Design a binder for this molecule. Sequence first.
Ligand SMILES: CCCCCc1ccc(C(=O)N(Cc2ccc(N(C)c3ccncc3)cc2)C2CCN(CCC(C)C)CC2)cc1
Length: 329
Amino acid sequence: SSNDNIELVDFQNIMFYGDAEVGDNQQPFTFILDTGSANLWVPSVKCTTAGCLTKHLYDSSKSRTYEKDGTKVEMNYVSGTVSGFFSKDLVTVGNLSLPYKFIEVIDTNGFEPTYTASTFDGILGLGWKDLSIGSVDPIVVELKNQNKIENALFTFYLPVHDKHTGFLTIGGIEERFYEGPLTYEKLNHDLYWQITLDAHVGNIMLEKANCIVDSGTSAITVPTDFLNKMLQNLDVIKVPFLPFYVTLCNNSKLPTFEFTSENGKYTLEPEYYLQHIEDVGPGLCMLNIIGLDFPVPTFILGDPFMRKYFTVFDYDNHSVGIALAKKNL
Ligand SMILES: CCCCCc1ccc(C(=O)N(Cc2ccc(N(C)c3ccncc3)cc2)C2CCN(CCC(C)C)CC2)cc1
């Protein structure tokens, strides 16, 4: 068949991770595979902060193919800076390798306590060129330019806890991952993977909303007027001053999301967006839904939508393909 398959392992419903390697000595890292960002971030041996000391670390000096670039990278994150510099070396994802401009991270003093909390070493972006720091070409675009993959496209088939493992697949579409038709939705900007759909939840309707498909987000985010409208009378309880909503897991009044285009119709039922706190039926659950206002009405179709729908990200045809994920492998 061909095609590069990268196993996705789940970590307690919050996130999933894939393995990649750096340098020709094959230095192993755990990565967040993030369609909402466009850079490869790797922690350096020269990083000496609590947490870096818990992570797998990059050592340029052990790698014959290291290629100095040193270009300073400064990123003032929300109260605390993340900083490093550019390096080039041989990145290996699955069974493919290529030279790539990544960011060797020196300091993580604004990505805490997030970094130490989780068990990933780095972040690997999969967005578009215009979204990167420096002007780095997307890994998949490059692999196509270097004739290593058939098509400039990747797919996500996400893990489902205690059910199956998952895959990022580079280079072509694999039939085993889905059921039903595979409809395509054209990008409306080459930045995030963003498409135009009509969003409809029972009575509430919003025509031609911007929908970002993003593996790096673990909620469905929703415009706040939408959320407010849609939660009235649902027997849901809002924990005061925090983006959390608590419900019995069997609340039969929970609504289904509806996204429609000319080409297709996508729904996301309660069972896909509930987090189970406890299952002593009727169970306690939280809604995996955040209100979030963008300059333009936007939905972030994150991990919950991707768990149900298999997704194709196509650089060549400037589009996202969506199909129902096979319940099993
Ligand atoms: C070696 C470590 C270096 C990594 C440093 C770092 C780089 C980039 C980002 C970031 O902005 N990211 C990447 C990022 C990915 C995952 C996370 N985490 C870990 C996460 C996600 C979901 N749930 C829990 C935790 C944090 C940050 C953002 C996240 C928000 N995205 C929203 C896009 C939306 C479509 C508008 C844009 C990209 C953070 C830290």
